[PDB]
């Protein structure tokens, strides 16, 4: 009725990128401003997902490690799903994991072309 607990679509979100190339994301974000974030897929071995964010005209990349039915980009904490991982950084600064960075998720990649 009220609770929308009937299959959730992650692709519906504007921050959900498909099989995008590395060089592409670089050029795509190059035009976008700071605060822009996105998540692409990659057919790698240890890494399954790939995250990207723009900060101070610098396109950063974050590898996503998913194993043992759990998701996590670092080697300290774990998540139950990509959503929990995204929402965590969406509200909390990345400085916690990456001291070099101090930004958060605000606008998607397909926000404004």
């Amino acid at each position: 009725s009220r609770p929308p607990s009937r299959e959730i679509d992650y692709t519906a979100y504007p921050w959900f990128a498909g099989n995008m190339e590395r060089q592409q994301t670089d050029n795509l974000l190059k035009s976008h401003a700071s605060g822009t974030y996105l998540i692409r897929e990659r057919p790698a071995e240890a890494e399954r997902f790939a995250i990207s964010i723009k900060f101070n005209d610098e396109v950063k990349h974050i590898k996503v490690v998913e194993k043992d039915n759990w998701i996590h980009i670092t080697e300290a904490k774990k998540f139950d799903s990509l959503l929990e991982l995204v929402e965590y950084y969406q509200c909390h600064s990345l400085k916690e994991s990456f001291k070099q960075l101090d930004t958060t998720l605000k606008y998607p990649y397909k926000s404004r072309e």
Partner: peptide
């Protein structure tokens, strides 16, 4: 030919 990325460091 190796994954750099940001990484915790």
């Amino acid at each position: 030919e190796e994954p750099v990325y940001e990484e915790v460091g």
